[model samples]
Target: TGELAKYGLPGVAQLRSRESYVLSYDPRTRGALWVLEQLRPERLRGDGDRSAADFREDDSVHAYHRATNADYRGSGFDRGALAAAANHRWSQRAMDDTFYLSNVAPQVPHLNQNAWNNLERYSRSLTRTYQNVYVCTGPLFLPRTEADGKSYVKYQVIGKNHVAVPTHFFKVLILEAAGGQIELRSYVMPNAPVDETIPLERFLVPIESIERASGLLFVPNILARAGNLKAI
Candidate 1:
């Protein structure tokens, strides 16, 4: 039913996941391959009405030397981008889990609070207008940009923990269309300020653009699917 989940697939099984989110960690970069989550019309209802949670360090990310609370200070990196999967506003514990450093990433302020947040807020409005939505938030290191106009990638790490800061960030959204077909939208933005006045939809990009940029395989629509139960 949700093939978008495949795009966030980790390269190794040992990387971690949360209640409904999964992330692939890079030891050298200390960044994530992707953070994946499924959203239902009911989840954003805030019916469970969790605690007034705050961002906290995720001690669970044991391998990350810098996945600590202090890393994000003044750096403009955020503990919230992982929110796509951790959009667990319905449950208190679920909401808190979204704060883990493992799900965190460095992002610019205007972009984080403005453009990035703009899309996220709009996504919440979707549950009321649609039946289903799937979101994938991830980093893009991007290859070197040459005068020729094509790009190549290299690791760009930051902070005492040496977490990788991406040249850009991305979001891939999937929705169920009328008659049960899949509709897709994707976006990629510089990890810098995006004018607040600009419409978020302006960032809309082709799903294939992300696949090519990230070198990740994402099947936007998988009509029939099954689940494998594993410990959360």
Candidate 2:
């Protein structure tokens, strides 16, 4: 589990630094890996009233609200199509043992029934045409800016998973003004086996979405440097 807040550059930088430092050490080394894992903050369990899915639903709504802003609306086209592409790419990259449909905390309950239903429908369509079918869901940490200024928050699935890795991570930045709707910007990274090399060409949806969703730029080459650092 992770923290939920509006997007903030500093906060994102800190979190990214932490994640990268941890991943830098070899997981196969028991001493190093165990020490690093112990340092990780406990997986966040939401308050009894809100489930993980509930957070996802809120995140989706927030994304839609942000994407439709007058200043940002015309910048991109066919969000639905973009989302579909993401799904297709993620499905393509899945292994035989896929972990689709994560079990959300029982306390919060599932609130994104509509989104889940749509994912199921699309997944089935893919199965009919594609050779393999795989899906999974978990909390993605997104950063957003609110009335208080740059902050961070989490967004649920707004589109398909576009990438060719077993797992991927996303960092979203949302901005919301008083009485104004939420606006979204995003950064995404592949979180698969370290040996797995992602091609420059494979970053289609993730890159495009980040550009369209958030004006703040992300350079994968630079970000990947974090993955090569030494853990404290």
Candidate 3:
């Protein structure tokens, strides 16, 4: 059983509906654009499945597996396979079942014109509406199809304000695992004046704290390591 059946459909549907409204209002809201694109699996994944039409209600593990496999690449058992391995470890430590199959992708606005414009509009709206500081980031994903027709996912995290949550101080961390070995890297945003990067070795905060503090609901640890760290 996968969590997708419990929340993915309704959550995505509501998100998409909200996106359509936002797009109609400005046609440049980045989050809105992403929601719209996500609604179109054909656009998001490049191949549509009639069987996936009711994906929200299906409990079949294979369905979830296929969907997830489509979004990510690499052997689940291989530690050094991709950048998300750090997140996989954090999820295990936190006992976060929801994030077990979670994967990371780059946010590339240029490739998707609608998403790019929408993100810009959304960021501006956040600044104006909240009257607080705001930042944005981008990363892109590249997937290679396998013999079983599943994609292998790989990508880089980019942009500003990539932290898991809105904070006044933060740093980015990266971890990769392959063949049972793990590598960790702590990075600071070059665009930001003050250096905030911290090494994973010194990161004592629990994975759960990092997730909660970062406001990243998916794989918080992964996002934190991917160069999205930000401070107010």
Candidate 4:
């Protein structure tokens, strides 16, 4: 990868093709603010239940090594650690796009493998109930504003890339109902050990809430039901 061309590309991370999801990659955070993708039953993968492929440092962002200092190693992944895995092991047939560092973030092992995994499974189950769904996954670098009006973004950085390990992660889903209606839901969870016993509703949040926390807009054209929809 051309090191300088990484920045040379200019404006958000676009590999040139709109593969259904777009990432507004920020050099400041050294990771993506959000990632958007579509979920279709046909595209939803079955649990290969086999085993995981290598979750190594994706060289995709390696091009920015000089600038991001990909030379730095955090969370012990040694340069390529804190994988922000895109596609799941079961639904995925090949290991093509799942390894992009662009798709990765510094994630806590327990949180990544447990509650977050549950949310993913729940999304896949929806495929059986709906024709297709749009999924938006993102990193939440919630900022802490100071009394002096000088606020600093508070979060953990796990790599020399200055890759920010989000204090939280979110999953925004748009589902098609059995009677042919649209349903929208968003969930947010801390990047720490969460007991599986905690109710999913415990993390349920309004799309507007996510919009406020993240500097991004979502669900621009969907019906704005009293409880579910709003102008994004």
Of models 2 and 4, which has the larger lDDT? 4
Cα lDDT of model 1 by residue, 1-232, tens digit:
8677677664454467677577776655665678877787667654454465566666655554546656666566665455553367766666666777677787877777778887887776676655677788888877778788987666545666777777788887766544555566778888878787887778877766788888676663342341221111
lDDT of 3 at 213: 41
Candidate 3, residues 1-232: lDDT per residue as tens digits?
A: 7675774453232121221111111111111111111111111222322221111211222232212322323322111111111111222322222122211222222322332233233333333323222121222122469899997753331223121111122222222222322232221121112222333234233434433543433245435544343321
Return the top candidate by lDDT: 1
The weakest ten consecutive residues by lDDT in model 3 span 22-31
Local distance difference test scores for all models: 0.68, 0.25, 0.24, 0.62
TM-score for candidate 3: 0.20
lDDT of 3 at 184: 26
Which scores better on lDDT, 1 or 3? Answer: 1
Best-first order by lDDT: 1, 4, 2, 3
Q: Which pairs clash in model 1? A: 29-164, 143-152, 143-153, 144-152
lDDT (Cα, tens digit) per residue for candidate 2, span 61-158: 12322222121123221111111222222222221111111111111112222333333343334344333332222222336688889785533322
- For all predicted structures, in order, the TM-scores are 0.79, 0.25, 0.20, 0.72
- Comparing 1 and 3 by TM-score, which wins? 1
Determine the C-alpha RMSD for candidate 4 after optimal superposition of all C-alphas: 6.3
